[PDB]
Nucleic acid binder design. Structure first.
Ligand SMILES: [Ca+2]
Lengths: 407, 476, 102
RNA sequence: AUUGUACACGGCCGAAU
DNA sequence: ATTCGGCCGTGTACAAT
């Protein structure tokens, strides 16, 4: 709460009323920015279609009363250095509420001085129909751009913060790699793939003794230590196992909804039934649906929403990145041979809104996955081993003038 | 905990100290940074009598002015002014008499009449190079030579269809081979297809045989082509506006290119630094070292000898070692490279150095709420690794010139770096505006990194140990 | 030289030449378009060497822009300039028309 | 190859099992 | 064989919502 919020911030609110009845557009811009605070566009009263002409406005608030050199002819106000596009500097009185505009495309010799706004010809009245319109500029051949002077925007990021369990089970094994030990696992019961084997060492977020992996692990050498000694350490190997363990844990999780392509590194939605459409329900603060696993309408090919999930360690914290992609299948299970034309066709059409929606969908899927259902054994008695959470929105200092552009 | 930033568009310098953020507008108002002594740029033309006459009319057509191809976005697609007071280069592009060499219809049939594609390209290069040697040693001495290839020659050389069976798939590139084989000539050369100086011309694509190639509007083509012609004539169009209190810095971009055998990997480097006064030097050199392999990275000795060479080139113009040396690389900096570079700096007494890996394959990205992507210059700090958006929504253009959302550049400085990532990102973003091969300033990659790759394409065909000119005009 | 002509004032009533000189430089263009030319205003960039000569001049100097395509003439005092750039002048198509009305 | 981006495809490299 | 990292090369589509 600034000390000028009552005066400066609410001063522009009353200024808009004069322009609102005049019939000229007012587009919100930066409060204290270089060049403009609002935008004026002339409009046809009968139709309301745009005329392609713009003009900027800058307003600064003061106190009630008079200023230096003010008799009953005019007054004398100074323009501070920090304020292209010529702009009217509209003022505002408080004792009797008389706004005072003045041009900046005007050249009274050198303008580097005090702008003595006249009290007879600088009154901001509805006479601006042709008076102010004479100064308005156009976006034609001269090439007047719209500089971004706004309060910025809130941008989302692909990262999801991963909260690892406070304990990790590390143990030896008579096996070297998971490939050497996967045949040992499959012949037993209670098969679970969520583990990593390297350097004859066994790493898994679950206790190996409880589940069916007892054969591979030395059952007497199962020791639980904190993850900060295995994940957040400078050892290159330990990072690689954490990369492996995170994916497999994510792979075993969300298995009711996603499938993994072994040859690639691509996660994609699995198809219920055979060769039929599907849908997903994800958060935005709104309920949005999308054809996650959709068979085409023109033909029978099936397109599954896909993402390349990769893990990064930033600021001694583990993050998961989401890279939206697509997987094409003839009937939802068999990969579609020669998918280049279809894959490239869809990628060529998406824009910022489409990719952002896909990112939010995958963010919702993972963040909701860590949550547990109310009932016991509803999905699994142990809680999901990975808890994700959205990062706070990125606060950019400048905003894209999307409103000024077409559509 | 990621701190955001939106850098202002770096200011470029034109004419007599004029400043602008757009190369086209700055050239239009103030003119080139280095003005030519004389109002005519003698351009030689090589091609069939149809193309030579066709391109010559185009050069005169640009003098009369070309209407903008899209009035809706007058900044992204501006109109070429012409010869008035808005002349972007303050010079006339004319073809003097006797500066044209005609490729006879017989000579075209010799190239088209060869079965194997590789032999046709080699035969064409010798044929063109012989004509090129005729122009330079003749009375009419041009400043830049424009090779206006005819449509039938383009079909044989590029699309290879007139095709024989594929043998490995490493088909020769006519442009790179031609540029390499004429590196000993004293005048730079420019290749121009007919569809750029004539909207009626249509060359079908190589694989998609039923579709012609889509080109920019005529005004945009004139802007990019004449700017390249002016640069190759021997003058710098524009330069980054230097801060008054800035360290004397030298930028060195390092890149790699596959050898002609397709397996080995060589190192191609480009160096950017502003000479004393109003000027900008862009050198292109290959590391004079013999350590052959497939590694996309340098060795300890290789990097040291490379940095020493770059410092000596800087010392030739300034007579003093640079205060700062920023090294941009296309691959991650390893321990042997960093200690190799540091050894070179210690011998030369360089104070500060930055080792930055410019990664383009990073999947990290941010998305604003709307139909358009984030602003160009958006920067996000990831624990030191910098996420920079050199491409995106450009307020000056009024739109985002791209198909899909832009992929941000991820800057990964090595631990042996001085400046903060925010400072480095501001320099990397500024370096994208001095490519000089195009007048559109929303370039994705910094110039030293981009210039290194462009040098690599030409140098695949130059045999090792052969001395070649380091002027970037011979590679752009 | 720096200037292209000299304007000498003369009283329209009595015809007496006041003896006051006024330097004039004329830039002539053929079907051109000045930098950022709207339907009501445009700009012009003065050469840096021209500014140095005009400062040393002991008489006022005006710059007159003449276009042959539309027979339009505009004038402006060289000392008068945009507050930002010393080499930039902002002409107004309404008040800067060079004619007997001025 | 006026100009670059996005996409697709392919080849290859670095560390440990 | 895997798992993690990466890089360079050749084509099409499009001129930007
Ligand atoms: Ca070029």
């Amino acid at each position: 709460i600034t000390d000028s919020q009552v005066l400066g911030e609410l001063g522009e609110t009353a200024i808009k009323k004069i322009v609102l009845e005049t019939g000229f557009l007012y587009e919100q811009r930066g409060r204290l920015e270089a060049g403009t605070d609002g935008i004026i566009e002339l409009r046809d009263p009968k139709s309301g279609a745009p005329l392609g002409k713009l003009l900027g406005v800058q307003v600064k608030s003061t106190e009630s009363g008079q200023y230096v050199r003010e008799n009953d002819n005019s007054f004398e106000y100074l323009l501070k250095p920090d304020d292209n596009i010529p702009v009217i500097i509209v003022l505002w009185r408080k004792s009797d509420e008389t706004a005072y505009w003045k041009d900046v495309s005007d050249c009274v010799r050198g303008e580097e001085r005090r702008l003595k706004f006249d009290k007879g010809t600088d009154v901001f009245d509805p006479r601006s129909a042709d008076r102010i319109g004479a100064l308005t500029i156009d976006r034609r051949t001269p090439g007047v751009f719209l500089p971004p002077l706004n309060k910025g925007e809130d941008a989302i990021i692909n990262l999801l913060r991963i909260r690892l369990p406070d304990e990790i089970f590390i143990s030896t094994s008579p096996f070297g790699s998971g490939r050497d030990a996967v045949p040992e696992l499959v012949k037993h019961g209670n098969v679970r793939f969520d583990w990593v084997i390297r350097k004859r060492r066994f790493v898994s977020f679950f206790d190996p003794r409880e589940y069916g992996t007892r054969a591979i692990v030395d059952l007497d050498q199962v020791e639980a230590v904190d993850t900060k000694l295995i994940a957040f350490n400078d050892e290159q190997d330990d990072l690689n196992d954490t990369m492996d363990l995170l994916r497999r844990t994510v792979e075993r999780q969300t298995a009711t909804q996603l499938s993994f392509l072994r040859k690639d590194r691509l996660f994609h939605f699995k198809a219920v039934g055979v060769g039929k459409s599907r849908s997903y329900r994800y958060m935005s603060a709104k309920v949005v649906s999308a054809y996650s696993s959709k068979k085409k309408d023109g033909w029978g090919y099936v397109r599954h929403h896909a993402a390349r999930l990769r893990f990064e360690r930033l600021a001694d914290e583990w993050f998961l990145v989401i890279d939206p992609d697509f997987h094409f299948t003839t009937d939802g299970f068999q990969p579609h041979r020669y998918p280049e034309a279809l894959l490239a066709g869809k990628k060529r059409l998406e824009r910022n809104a489409a990719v952002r929606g896909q990112v939010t969908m995958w963010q919702h899927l993972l963040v909701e996955s860590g949550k547990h259902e109310v009932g016991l054994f509803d999905a699994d008695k142990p809680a999901p081993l990975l808890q994700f959470e959205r990062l706070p929105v990125i606060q950019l200092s400048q905003a894209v003038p999307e409103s000024s552009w077409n559509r | 905990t990621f701190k955001a930033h939106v850098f202002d568009e770096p200011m470029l310098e034109f004419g007599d100290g004029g400043q602008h953020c757009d190369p086209r507008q700055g050239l239009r108002e103030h003119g080139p940074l280095q003005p030519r002594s004389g109002d005519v740029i003698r351009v030689g033309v090589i091609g069939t009598d149809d193309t030579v006459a066709g391109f010559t009319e185009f050069l005169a057509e640009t003098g009369r002015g070309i209407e903008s191809g899209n009035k809706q976005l007058i900044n992204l697609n501006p109109d070429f002014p012409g010869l008035g007071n808005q002349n972007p280069f303050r010079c006339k592009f004319e073809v003097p008499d006797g500066a044209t060499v005609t490729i006879s219809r017989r000579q075209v049939n010799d190239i088209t009449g060869i079965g194997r594609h590789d032999e046709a390209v080699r035969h064409a290069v010798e044929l063109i190079s012989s004509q090129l040697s005729a122009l330079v040693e003749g009375s009419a001495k041009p400043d830049v030579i424009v090779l206006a290839l005819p449509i039938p020659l383009i079909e044989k050389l590029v699309n290879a269809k007139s095709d024989d069976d594929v043998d490995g798939g490493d088909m020769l590139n006519f442009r790179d081979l031609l540029k390499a084989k004429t590196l000993h000539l004293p005048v730079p050369t420019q290749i121009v297809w007919p569809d750029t100086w004539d909207d009626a011309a249509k060359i079908p694509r190589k694989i998609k045989r039923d579709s012609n190639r889509q080109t920019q509007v005529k005004a945009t083509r004139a802007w990019n082509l004449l700017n390249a012609l002016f640069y190759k004539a021997g003058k710098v169009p524009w330069r980054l506006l230097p801060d008054q209190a800035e360290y004397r810095t030298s930028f060195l971009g390092i890149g790699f290119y596959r050898d002609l055998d397709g397996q080995q990997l060589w190192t191609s480097t480009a160096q950017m630094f502003d000479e004393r006064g109003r000027g900008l030097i862009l050198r292109g050199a290959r590391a004079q070292t013999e350590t052959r392999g497939r590694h996309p990275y340098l060795t300890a000795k290789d990097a040291e000898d490379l940095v020493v060479q770059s410092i000596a080139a800087y010392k030739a113009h300034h007579r003093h070692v640079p205060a700062r040396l920023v090294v941009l690389k296309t691959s991650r900096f390893r321990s042997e490279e960093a200690e190799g570079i540091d050894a070179a700096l210690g011998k030369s007494g360089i104070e500060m150095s930055d080792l930055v890996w410019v990664q383009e394959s990073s999947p990290i990205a941010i998305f604003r709420d709307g139909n358009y992507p984030v602003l160009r210059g958006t920067f996000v700090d990831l624990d030191g690794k910098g996420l920079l958006y050199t491409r995106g929504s450009v307020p000056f253009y009024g739109t985002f010139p791209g198909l899909r959302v832009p992929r941000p550049l991820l800057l990964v400085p090595h631990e042996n770096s001085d400046s903060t990532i925010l400072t480095l990102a501001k320099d990397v973003l500024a370096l994208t505006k001095v490519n000089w091969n195009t007048t559109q300033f929303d370039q994705k990659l910094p110039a030293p990194i981009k210039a290194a790759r462009e040098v690599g394409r030409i140098l695949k065909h130059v045999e090792f140990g052969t001395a070649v000119s380091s002027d970037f005009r011979r590679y752009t | 030289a720096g200037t292209d002509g000299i304007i000498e004032l003369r009283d329209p009533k009595s015809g007496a030449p006041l003896g006051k000189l006024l330097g004039v430089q004329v830039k002539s263009t053929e079907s051109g378009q000045y930098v950022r030319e709207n339907d009501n205003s445009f700009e012009y960039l003065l050469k840096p060497d021209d500014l140095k000569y005009w400062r040393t001049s002991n008489i006022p100097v005006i710059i007159v822009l003449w276009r042959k395509s539309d027979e339009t003439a505009y004038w402006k005092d060289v000392s008068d300039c945009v507050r930002g750039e010393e080499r930039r002048l902002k002409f107004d198509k309404g008040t800067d028309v060079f004619d007997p009305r001025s």
